[PDB]
Design an enzyme around this catalytic site. Structure first.
Site, PDB file in Angstrom:
ATOM      1  N   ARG A  43     -10.072  10.022  -8.633  1.00  0.00           N
ATOM      2  CA  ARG A  43     -10.982  10.184  -7.496  1.00  0.00           C
ATOM      3  C   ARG A  43     -10.866  11.555  -6.843  1.00  0.00           C
ATOM      4  O   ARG A  43      -9.875  12.271  -6.990  1.00  0.00           O
ATOM      5  CB  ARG A  43     -10.698   9.139  -6.425  1.00  0.00           C
ATOM      6  CG  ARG A  43     -10.437   7.741  -6.955  1.00  0.00           C
ATOM      7  CD  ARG A  43     -10.508   6.688  -5.864  1.00  0.00           C
ATOM      8  NE  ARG A  43      -9.734   6.920  -4.673  1.00  0.00           N
ATOM      9  CZ  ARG A  43      -8.469   6.546  -4.484  1.00  0.00           C
ATOM     10  NH1 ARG A  43      -7.798   5.891  -5.424  1.00  0.00           N
ATOM     11  NH2 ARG A  43      -7.902   6.749  -3.297  1.00  0.00           N
ATOM     12  N   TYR A  85       0.868  -1.195   0.000  1.00  0.00           N
ATOM     13  CA  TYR A  85       0.000   0.000   0.000  1.00  0.00           C
ATOM     14  C   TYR A  85       0.893   1.229   0.000  1.00  0.00           C
ATOM     15  O   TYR A  85       1.459   1.618   1.011  1.00  0.00           O
ATOM     16  CB  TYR A  85      -0.955  -0.044   1.198  1.00  0.00           C
ATOM     17  CG  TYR A  85      -1.890   1.118   1.365  1.00  0.00           C
ATOM     18  CD1 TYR A  85      -2.249   1.932   0.288  1.00  0.00           C
ATOM     19  CD2 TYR A  85      -2.411   1.420   2.589  1.00  0.00           C
ATOM     20  CE1 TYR A  85      -3.121   2.968   0.497  1.00  0.00           C
ATOM     21  CE2 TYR A  85      -3.289   2.457   2.777  1.00  0.00           C
ATOM     22  CZ  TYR A  85      -3.610   3.248   1.716  1.00  0.00           C
ATOM     23  OH  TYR A  85      -4.455   4.293   1.978  1.00  0.00           O
ATOM     24  N   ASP A 108      -1.376   5.176  -4.567  1.00  0.00           N
ATOM     25  CA  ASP A 108      -2.181   6.426  -4.610  1.00  0.00           C
ATOM     26  C   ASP A 108      -1.267   7.625  -4.799  1.00  0.00           C
ATOM     27  O   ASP A 108      -0.262   7.799  -4.102  1.00  0.00           O
ATOM     28  CB  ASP A 108      -3.043   6.644  -3.360  1.00  0.00           C
ATOM     29  CG  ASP A 108      -4.490   6.118  -3.502  1.00  0.00           C
ATOM     30  OD1 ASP A 108      -4.908   5.676  -4.589  1.00  0.00           O
ATOM     31  OD2 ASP A 108      -5.223   6.208  -2.499  1.00  0.00           O
ATOM     32  N   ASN A 120       1.142   4.972  -0.703  1.00  0.00           N
ATOM     33  CA  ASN A 120       0.787   6.393  -0.839  1.00  0.00           C
ATOM     34  C   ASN A 120       2.092   7.044  -1.266  1.00  0.00           C
ATOM     35  O   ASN A 120       3.046   7.087  -0.494  1.00  0.00           O
ATOM     36  CB  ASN A 120       0.319   6.937   0.488  1.00  0.00           C
ATOM     37  CG  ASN A 120      -1.039   6.467   0.838  1.00  0.00           C
ATOM     38  OD1 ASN A 120      -2.022   6.889   0.229  1.00  0.00           O
ATOM     39  ND2 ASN A 120      -1.128   5.542   1.817  1.00  0.00           N
ATOM     40  N   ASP A 158     -11.280  12.033  -2.750  1.00  0.00           N
ATOM     41  CA  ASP A 158     -11.581  11.346  -1.505  1.00  0.00           C
ATOM     42  C   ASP A 158     -12.024  12.386  -0.473  1.00  0.00           C
ATOM     43  O   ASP A 158     -11.217  13.177  -0.010  1.00  0.00           O
ATOM     44  CB  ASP A 158     -10.375  10.572  -1.002  1.00  0.00           C
ATOM     45  CG  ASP A 158     -10.036   9.352  -1.837  1.00  0.00           C
ATOM     46  OD1 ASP A 158     -10.691   9.042  -2.845  1.00  0.00           O
ATOM     47  OD2 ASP A 158      -9.039   8.649  -1.428  1.00  0.00           O
TER      48      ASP A 158
END
Length: 125
Positions: free
Chosen positions: A80, A32, A112, A34, A82
């Site tokens: 997106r 993950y 991301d 970022n 968010d």
């Protein structure tokens, strides 16, 4: 589930305030990333990261979504905004694009892309 469907389900579960169920779709060893933050490894650590910001309302808007690959494996790209509301009334709206690698209904990596300076400014009380 196709890669696209897996990511749609992930984002729906986030928007349904079901972070446990969303994180169930992440691989146990998910990467993950970022991009301007330290990398998070594993489902549990991803779930923890997502609850570091205590939100009472969450709306991750999907502006566009499209996938590479085939019905089993591929990379799903997302555009997106968010949005979320924190306990204290802080409201945030983070413009972000995300890439999700999926194999057989499991998200193996999530990258991301956003501006950390803007994120920090929005977090400033």
């Amino acid at each position: 589930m196709t890669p696209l469907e897996t990511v749609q389900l992930f984002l729906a579960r986030v928007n349904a305030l079901d972070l446990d169920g969303a994180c169930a779709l992440l691989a146990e060893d998910v990467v993950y990333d970022n991009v301007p933050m330290p990398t998070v490894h594993g489902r549990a650590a991803a779930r923890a990261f997502l609850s570091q910001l205590p939100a009472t309302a969450i709306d991750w808007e999907t502006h566009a979504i499209a996938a590479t690959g085939d019905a089993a494996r591929g990379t799903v790209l997302t555009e997106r905004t968010d949005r979320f509301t924190l306990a204290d009334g802080r409201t945030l709206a983070i413009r972000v694009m995300g890439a999700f690698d999926v194999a057989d209904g499991s998200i193996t990596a999530w990258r991301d892309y956003f501006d950390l300076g803007q994120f920090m400014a929005q977090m400033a009380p």
